Amino acid sequence: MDFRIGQGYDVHQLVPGRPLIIGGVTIPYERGLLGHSDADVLLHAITDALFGAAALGDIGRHFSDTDPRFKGADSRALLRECASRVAQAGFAIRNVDSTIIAQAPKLAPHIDAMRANIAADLDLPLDRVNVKAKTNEKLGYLGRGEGIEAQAAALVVRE
Amino acid sequence: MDFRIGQGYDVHQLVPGRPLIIGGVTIPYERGLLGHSDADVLLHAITDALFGAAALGDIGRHFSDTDPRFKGADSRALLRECASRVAQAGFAIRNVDSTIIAQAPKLAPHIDAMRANIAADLDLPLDRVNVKAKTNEKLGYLGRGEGIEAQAAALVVRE
Amino acid sequence: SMDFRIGQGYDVHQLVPGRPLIIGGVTIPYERGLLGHSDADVLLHAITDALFGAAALGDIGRHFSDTDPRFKGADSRALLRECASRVAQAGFAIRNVDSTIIAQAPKLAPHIDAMRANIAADLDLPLDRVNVKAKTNEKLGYLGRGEGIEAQAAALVVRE
Ligand SMILES: CS(=O)(=O)Nc1cccc2cccnc12
Ligand SMILES: [Zn+2]
Ligand SMILES: [Zn+2]
Ligand SMILES: [Zn+2]
């Protein structure tokens, strides 16, 4: 009964010239996300929520851009290593929920694929992983298509 | 002991010539929220948190903003149907918390009425529902009064 | 008990000249500081609102008035301690807190551990039940331009 909650946030700029990768899914679009490696805003937010629930710090403390051990690691590899550390710290993951905020493109066709990737990386039943997606109603840098945000929540239990 | 957490976010533009309906409360104001439904940003955020905790997707999956049957829809009726589907999936709701962020109007006089509406719609006592209200401290489109944001968290248990 | 409850909090403060930068109780060298009551500690405000939310006690604005003589000179750690007292008064025990600070500058990583220790002391929690995370906003929006700093928090409590 030693439950803990975690929460996560990430945002990346959206400009022409890079692929759009969210939840491990490459999505055709005239723009993509800027950042180190694949810039997968959804997996980053979930990773931070899991480290947070385990009180293990954050994604930057575990996976430095300088560290050679993770030099060529994509965000799914980081999520799997996060899950390994959360387990070794004594915690079992109970569920993950999340939201992607992007004015475009439409993400609904890709939700099942993202959920499948996340559930595989976390070794969770599919019904314990949820991804939601919406626009920002044309408000702000998100509403103008200048970036994409992700939010995540995770529940774990100390075993 | 099969607890799950969900999180929700929503934003809508503030425009002339629309009712301002937040938490089910019609608030006297010269502007209202723009949306396909009644645009109740707080109830939408809570709806998303509940679908998310149950791994049932999101509000756009269940109540599409392109379906004419939801034009002008009462978001309390949508929230009640969400709660019915969460129950049908096997979950009982344990608590909801939420935040509304707006430059104006003052929401303190209306918070208790919003809490009572949500509690009624979710078949919860008042002591399991919370609504918080604040400004965005003058920053961004929220500081400029261009829209209103809501955030929500929900805890459920699979019975 | 098995009567768990979750709360969520959000706050943002403007960065202004002539004030110290205090986040999580830590004074951080910087040319600007946060605008608000006393030390304007945006992280402690977000945690405070998450704790009130988890206990269904409302929010900061309903608990802490500018006119209350008990709190006129109170800093954000005194208010966080008072929040925790009111959570306990309502019959709840805190199980864990997690949080994120979004600041484009300065670097917060050297200060995280001290923030965690401050929060744990104020909430009477062991360090392993308190977490603080730090992020930039990738140069987007008012956060990315350095006009303010945001904090987010989540709290789990149980009705004892
Ligand atoms: C700008 S401040 O530092 O004074 N903080 C606040 C002032 C006024 C109301 C608030 C409500 C929640 C969080 N912070 C609040
Ligand atoms: Zn990222
Ligand atoms: Zn909406
Ligand atoms: Zn504040």
Both structure tokens of B131: 């609504």
Residue numbers after which chain A breaks, C to N beyond 2.5 angstroms: none
CB A6 within 8 A of CB A151: no
Residue C49 CA to ligand 1 centre (angstroms): 10
Name residue, tokens 């955030």: B151
Ligand 1 mean position, distance from CA C89 (Å): 23
Q: B130 touching C, CB under 8 A?
A: yes
Structural contact between residues C53 and C9, judged by C-beta atoms closer than 8 angstroms: yes
Distance from CA of A151 to the nearest CA of B (A): 8
Neighbours of B69 (CB within 10 A): 7
CA-nearest residue for atom 5, ligand 1, is C36
Alpha-carbon distance B44 to B56, whole Å? 15
Give Cα separations from A92 to A9, A72, B156 (angstroms): 21, 28, 18
C96 is in an annotated binding site: no
Partners for A (CB, 8 Å, 3+ pairs)?
Answer: B, C
A18 touching chain C per CB within 8 A:
no
Q: Check CB contact under 8 Å for B129 and C56.
A: yes
- Token pair 């899914």 is found at A25
Is residue B110 a known part of a binding site?
no
**Under an 8 A CB cutoff, do C154 and A13 touch?**
no
Elucidated via: X-ray
| Cβ–Cβ under 8 Å, residues A135 and A143 | yes
For residue B3, what is the nearest residue in chain A, using CA coordinates?
A: A94
| 8 Å CB contact of C6 and B153 | yes
Q: Is the sign of the CA dihedral C33, C152, B58, B70 positive or negative? A: negative
Resolution in A: 1.5
d(CA A102, CA A147): 7
E runs forming strands in C46-160 = 92-102, 133-135, 148-159
Which one, of C86, C70, C75, lies nearest residue C123 by Cα? C86
Whole-angstrom Cα distance, residue A147 to residue A140? 10
Residue nearest to atom 14 of ligand 1 (CA): C45
Q: In whole angstroms, give the CA distance from residue A16 to residue A33.
A: 9
Place of tokens 């006690």: C57
Separation of alpha carbons A147 and A142, rounded Å: 5
* Separation of alpha carbons B148 and B27, rounded Å: 13
* B2 assigned ligand-binding residue: no
Measured from the Cβ of residue B26, the count of other Cβ atoms closer than 10 Å reads: 13
Q: In whole angstroms, what is the distance from residue B53 CA to residue B76 CA?
A: 19
**Residue B69 DSSP symbol:** G
Nearest to B132, CA basis, from C62, C55, C65: C62
Contact A157, A3 (CB under 8 A): yes
CB C28 within 8 A of CB C22: yes
| Identity at C35, one-letter amino acid code | L
Strand B31-33 to A147-158 pairing: unpaired
- Say if strands B147-158 and B91-101 run parallel, antiparallel, or are unpaired: antiparallel
In this structure, the residues whose C-beta lies within 6 A of any atom of ligand 1 are B 134, 137; C 11, 13, 36-37, 40, 45, 49, 60-61
